[PDB]
Design an enzyme around this catalytic site. Sequence first.
Site, PDB file in Angstrom:
ATOM      1  N   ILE A  42       5.607  -9.990  59.737  1.00  0.00           N
ATOM      2  CA  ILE A  42       5.529  -9.616  61.177  1.00  0.00           C
ATOM      3  C   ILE A  42       5.445 -10.836  61.844  1.00  0.00           C
ATOM      4  CG2 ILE A  42       4.193  -7.399  60.903  1.00  0.00           C
ATOM      5  CD1 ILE A  42       1.472  -9.733  61.401  1.00  0.00           C
ATOM      6  N   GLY A  54      10.918 -13.512  65.184  1.00  0.00           N
ATOM      7  CA  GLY A  54      11.684 -14.916  65.173  1.00  0.00           C
ATOM      8  C   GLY A  54      10.971 -15.841  64.336  1.00  0.00           C
ATOM      9  N   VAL A  91       6.041 -17.095  62.133  1.00  0.00           N
ATOM     10  CA  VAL A  91       5.945 -15.765  61.427  1.00  0.00           C
ATOM     11  C   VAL A  91       4.887 -15.738  60.259  1.00  0.00           C
ATOM     12  CG1 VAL A  91       7.943 -16.692  60.268  1.00  0.00           C
ATOM     13  CG2 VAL A  91       7.428 -14.050  60.478  1.00  0.00           C
ATOM     14  N   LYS A  96       0.964 -17.925  55.962  1.00  0.00           N
ATOM     15  CA  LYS A  96       1.493 -18.532  57.493  1.00  0.00           C
ATOM     16  C   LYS A  96       2.518 -19.779  57.371  1.00  0.00           C
ATOM     17  CE  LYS A  96       0.048 -20.638  61.439  1.00  0.00           C
ATOM     18  NZ  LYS A  96       1.025 -20.097  62.325  1.00  0.00           N
ATOM     19  N   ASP A 135      -9.928 -21.480  70.974  1.00  0.00           N
ATOM     20  CA  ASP A 135      -8.760 -20.402  71.149  1.00  0.00           C
ATOM     21  C   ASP A 135      -9.023 -19.000  70.964  1.00  0.00           C
ATOM     22  OD1 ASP A 135      -6.219 -19.840  71.836  1.00  0.00           O
ATOM     23  OD2 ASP A 135      -5.333 -19.752  69.802  1.00  0.00           O
TER      24      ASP A 135
END
Lengths: 190, 263, 298
Positions: free
Chosen positions: C10, C13, C17, C33, C127
């Site tokens: 998932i 691009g 990803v 990752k 974040d």
Amino acid sequence: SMVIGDFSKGYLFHTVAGKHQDLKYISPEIMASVLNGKFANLIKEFVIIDCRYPYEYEGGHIKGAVNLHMEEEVEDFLLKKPIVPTDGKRVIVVFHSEFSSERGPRMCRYVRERDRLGNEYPKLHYPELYVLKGGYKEFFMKCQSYCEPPSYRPMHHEDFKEDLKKFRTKSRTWAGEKSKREMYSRLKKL
Amino acid sequence: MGVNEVPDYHEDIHTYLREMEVKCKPKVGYMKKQPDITNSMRAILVDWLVEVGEEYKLQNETLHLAVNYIDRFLSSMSVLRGKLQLVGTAAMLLASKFEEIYPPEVAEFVYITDDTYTKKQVLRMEHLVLKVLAFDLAAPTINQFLTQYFLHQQPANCKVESLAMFLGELSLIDADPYLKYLPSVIAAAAFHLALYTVTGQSWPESLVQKTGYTLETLKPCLLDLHQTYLRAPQHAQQSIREKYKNSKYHGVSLLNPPETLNV
Amino acid sequence: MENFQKVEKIGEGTYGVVYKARNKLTGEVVALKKIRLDTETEGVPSTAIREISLLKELNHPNIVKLLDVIHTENKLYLVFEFLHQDLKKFMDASALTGIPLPLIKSYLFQLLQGLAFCHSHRVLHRDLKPQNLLINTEGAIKLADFGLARAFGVPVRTYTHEVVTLWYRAPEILLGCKYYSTAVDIWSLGCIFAEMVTRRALFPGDSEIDQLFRIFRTLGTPDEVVWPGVTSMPDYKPSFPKWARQDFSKVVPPLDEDGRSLLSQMLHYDPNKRISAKAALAHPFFQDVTKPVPHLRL
């Protein structure tokens, strides 16, 4: 949300859900219909900024699109001489990239930020900004008729790797210099 | 003051740093295991790193972290003389990537290297250092403890802080005998020496409760710090003295060390 | 690498990803990752270095787990424990009936515990958003995406300005404060809290000026009484509209008095007066906190 940036009317295009909730997306069907003459009377100008690198631009793009892969280029093209609208018509600007996940959204956000900075709240020069859903790949898959030349050049191609690295270096250097200049301007008048 | 000084987590952060500084401590006397480099080369490299950081206006935390990375890397890996500078460069690069908002590019690190190593060599050495350190780049330093200690002085005195930083950086050059002291002990000794030199005060009573360091247990480090503060003008490596002569540091290196310690 | 058998992928691009893989020998589901270094002209990125360095020390039930790092001269792989979906997907699936209030309370309690653990270890997430909060089937929510995380000092210095997502950015970052601290994260949680209750973003701004105007409209324009020193900020202009503070009864209708008070303390203008993660866990709002199990439609 459901109104354009200047809070005067709603979005004309049938919006589609996208990865970023900040922006408003449109699937390739909407732009395919628009390029087919579906909203001629209700749209004054239709800008399709191709936020991909020039070596991608030469490898296939939408008809009538303009390649602007740098923030300075987009500011020069859109905000230095804004397309003046009038009553009864609207100016719609559509950004896109290879997948419309990093570059196209970033350019759309930059254009909105610079339009807000240069005007008085809440007036905007381009209140209607869209991002093509799925990027140029989905448009090529579904609307290959309008892509001249009918070809697809990926960013991570085995060729043009040096060009991609150079463009990434240029973007990083510009962003860093802008950030340092802004930081100095802030700290000199804190 | 306030959320800037983190009043809810300052004690937790200090305890965590005290527990972490043991793990990130380099092996004492690793230079004996090295069959090609000695403490003189390490001192020269650390002086050159100080000059490099002064050239690019890097933080002091960057220099402390880079020296910690170099010591940890050398404590588990054997390098030749001609490669030593390279690892230093790599460590500095890594430290910048961990600390600086705008770290210098790899091209600049090759530039200050004076073209004795290439960009590919620097990147390979950075990969090797990251592999050896196992990505354990978050290490307590003398700066991190001195900065917390500075909150306990009343009234505040920037001369004391600058002198404490100067002494803590002076401790970086010589592996002997500051490899056997934790960063907290060196920071405490530097703070007390700066306080005695500038204002004539001593180790605060609000800090002996926070750290548990009395003037009796700081004596082994305090004696060495005083000795190399007295001998700083005659040291072969004089980059730190030049760096701390500037007006931004209040010219602390121009002060006179106390004749004797009232300990 | 070859040890992990890729199953699903998932992330459209080549943009960070992630791959849902299964360990070949032990049968463990993990999330890989991918970080590219051959295309990175400057070695390992600073964001990846910080994330790996800081995630190896954060061992909490409410923080995502970095099981392993596969290091190669051209590729970098971060192995994480697999969590089914993020909080944004859960809210989208539960957009009709909404997240039940006990579930919101449990999720907020867990997020506050994770943030308190992060802050007691000198880490600033910076974040925090629903896309970075990962839930599972059992009913546990964890902080994730520590790429923007940073290790701060006591006291803090001037750090990176452009950090938090604009929707969840604190007013001190928007007004260009020289120093920001842990109170930047708590604000984000407050926003997320509102997004969990009203099922919509609290301050959905498209620009820094628009975001500031939305914050001012909802909470009233700050002055020297509410936020001392706000008029001398570099990005503050004396031409800002003089808006009035809206009562929280209409801002978050479903919330009760305790929830309203906790949200008001989390969204305090002054970073000094803003509540902390440790002090929020002692709030009366969490007196009867219990952990339910989400339905997990998706």
